[PDB]
Each structure stands twice: as structure tokens, then as C-alpha cells.
């Protein structure tokens, strides 16, 4: 397993926006409670899973649990980034696994529900 994404960086400015607080206080939260989170809550155990291939596949590796990090650690820059991290966590699952898989219907799920909830954004 590698180490996680970096969820801090002393020479990017911290950073606050009102979209960026709505994706965490109402975006984040949702799909948190979802009862599909539960996979994508922290990092791809690749050597539990007993994935040898994954963080060779997947280059860029994300999930909710180093998005709420970055939420609260004011990592992100704007929103655009948040939003950009949420669909790389939803395609790493799509193009890693197979259809059908049930780890996909719920990344479908979860996916419908984030763009469910980013229509309901301000604008920054
Ligand atoms: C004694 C033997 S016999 C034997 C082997 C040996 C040693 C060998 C072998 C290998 C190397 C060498 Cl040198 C020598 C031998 N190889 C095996 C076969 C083999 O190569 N296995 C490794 C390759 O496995 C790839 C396929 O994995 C399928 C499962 N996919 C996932 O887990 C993806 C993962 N899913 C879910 C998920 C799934 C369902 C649901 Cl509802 C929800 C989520 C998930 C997350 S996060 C999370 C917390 C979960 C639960 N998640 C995300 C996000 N995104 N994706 C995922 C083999 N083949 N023929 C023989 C004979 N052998």
C-alpha cells in the first residue's frame, strides 16, 4: 500500500469558499451517510483486498475519507478541485472493476446522488 493522498500543504495557501463549504457540510454528508459509502471511506486497502495491480492502474488513487480531510484542512482551492476529486474516486471504481459488479451499481448510486446535490450549489 502506498501512503494515503496528501491531505495538507504548507505552501498551498489555506483556503475557504462557500461552495467549498457546501460541499462539505451538504454534499460530503449525504454520500457519508449513504449506505454505499462504506467502500469508498478511506483508501483502497490494496493488500487486504489483495489488489496487486490497483495503484499500478489507478495512478491518481481517491476517496471520501482524504476528501473530508482536505474539506476540513481547507486543502482545496476552490470547489472545482473538491468536485474534480469526488469524479476521480467515482472513475478509478469504473474503469478498475468490471460491469455488473456490485461495487459499481453502488459508485452509479453514489454518483447520481453527488450530481444530485452539486446542482444545488452557489456559484464561486
Ligand atoms: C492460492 C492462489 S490460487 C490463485 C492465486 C493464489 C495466490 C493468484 C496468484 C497471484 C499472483 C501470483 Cl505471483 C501467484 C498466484 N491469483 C488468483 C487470482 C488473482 O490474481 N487475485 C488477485 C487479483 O484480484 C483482482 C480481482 O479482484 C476482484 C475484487 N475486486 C475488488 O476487490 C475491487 C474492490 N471492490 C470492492 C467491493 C466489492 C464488492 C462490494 Cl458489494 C463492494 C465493494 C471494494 C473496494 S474498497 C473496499 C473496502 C471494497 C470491499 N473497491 C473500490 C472502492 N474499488 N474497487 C474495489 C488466482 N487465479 N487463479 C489461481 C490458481 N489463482
Redesign the pocket.
Known amino acids: 500500500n502506498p501512503p494515503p493522498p496528501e491531505t495538507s500543504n504548507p505552501n498551498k495557501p489555506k483556503r475557504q469558499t462557500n461552495q467549498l463549504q457546501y460541499l462539505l457540510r451538504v454534499v460530503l454528508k449525504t454520500l457519508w451517510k449513504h449506505q454505499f459509502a462504506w467502500?469508498?471511506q478511506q483508501p483502497?486497502?490494496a493488500v487486504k483486498?489483495?489488489?496487486?495491480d490497483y495503484y499500478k492502474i489507478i495512478k491518481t488513487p481517491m476517496d471520501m475519507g482524504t476528501i473530508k480531510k482536505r474539506l476540513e484542512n481547507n486543502y482545496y482551492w476552490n470547489a472545482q478541485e473538491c468536485i474534480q476529486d469526488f469524479n476521480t474516486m467515482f472513475t478509478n471504481?469504473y474503469i478498475?472493476?468490471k460491469p455488473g459488479?456490485?461495487?459499481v451499481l453502488?459508485a452509479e448510486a453514489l454518483e447520481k446522488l453527488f450530481l444530485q446535490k452539486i446542482n444545488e450549489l452557489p456559484t464561486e
Open positions: 467502500p469508498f483502497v486497502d483486498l489483495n489488489l496487486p471504481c478498475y472493476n459488479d456490485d461495487i453502488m
